[PDB]
Write a protein that binds this ligand. Structure first.
Ligand SMILES: *[C@@H]1O[C@H](CO)[C@@H](O[C@@H]2O[C@H](CO)[C@@H](O)[C@H](O)[C@H]2NC(C)=O)[C@H](O)[C@H]1NC(C)=O
Ligand SMILES: *[C@@H]1O[C@H](CO)[C@@H](O[C@@H]2O[C@H](CO)[C@@H](O)[C@H](O)[C@H]2NC(C)=O)[C@H](O)[C@H]1NC(C)=O
Ligand SMILES: *[C@@H]1O[C@H](CO)[C@@H](O)[C@H](O)[C@H]1NC(C)=O
Lengths: 48, 48
């Protein structure tokens, strides 16, 4: 149901965050791309 | 005109940002240092 990022030698899922991913390009030129949400922890801090 | 940071084996320029850099010392003990401006995306996030 959810998506996580983990290492390739031990199972240790983490929730997707901007600190864990690297952004580049557009959503057209990648085969097999899947859609989900990339979170941002700074928004609650800014709103508070 | 502009200064970028890129990898060594494939030309892919990224905009100079405080996330890509690392701070140490002052501007007197490095030969060939160059004046420029290091941007910061935190200010628009915390202001706008
Ligand atoms: C993104 O998720 C959606 C929903 O599953 C997929 O469907 C398309 O999404 C884009 C933008 O998210 C829309 O512009 C299209 O109209 C959607 N097509 C539909 C609903 O048939 C999409 O495949 C996912 N991936 C991308 C890259 O959009
Ligand atoms: C470019 O960098 C040099 C050295 O970092 C600057 O030279 C110094 O500038 C300060 C004030 O900006 C002065 O107080 C010093 O006397 C200057 N020293 C020398 C040896 O010139 C220079 O001003 C910088 N230029 C710009 C446009 O920022
Ligand atoms: C390269 O050599 C020139 C000599 O004309 C000098 O002015 C310049 O500072 C040198 N650049 C570096 C990075 O040392």
């Amino acid at each position: 149901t959810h998506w996580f990022v983990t290492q390739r030698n031990f199972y240790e899922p983490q929730i997707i965050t901007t600190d864990n991913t690297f952004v580049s390009g557009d959503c057209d030129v990648v085969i097999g791309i899947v859609n989900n949400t990339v979170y941002d922890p700074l928004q609650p801090e800014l709103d508070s």
